[PDB]
Amino acid sequence: PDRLLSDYIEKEVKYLGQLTSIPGYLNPSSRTEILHFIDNAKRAHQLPGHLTQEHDAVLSLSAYNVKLAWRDGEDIILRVPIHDIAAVSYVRDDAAHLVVLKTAQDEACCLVILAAESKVAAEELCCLLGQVFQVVY
């Protein structure tokens, strides 16, 4: 594609939550670190343990930003400009195909914790986000 400037793409995801005050030196290539902060967030109940459909969101992707919105009321959960996105990582937990966005903060950073419906979906999200990273200059 290259309709990232003039149009938007929507994908199926689950929104687990947003982790804040995470060390800015976090390596998005590191499974152990990301899972460290995620597991810690789960023990503190800042993230849900298992995925229901109450966590069903639409991810709208464009050259301007990444937008997440609930499926119920479609109220906007968060809006992250592409230049505020440091990276996107696919972490495969057992049943959860986690897609984690390392983003800037509104030097610490934020981890947007998402869950794709499958492996190919997560890899697709990472590819699309890569293309978006590239079309913006």
């Binding site: 998005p28 290539s29 590191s30 230049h83 990276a87 990582s89 696919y90 990472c126 890569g130």
Partner: peptide
């Protein structure tokens, strides 16, 4: 990690 894509223009 299974897959990682870096934004080379971050910041």
């Amino acid at each position: 990690v299974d897959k990682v894509v870096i934004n080379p223009y971050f910041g």
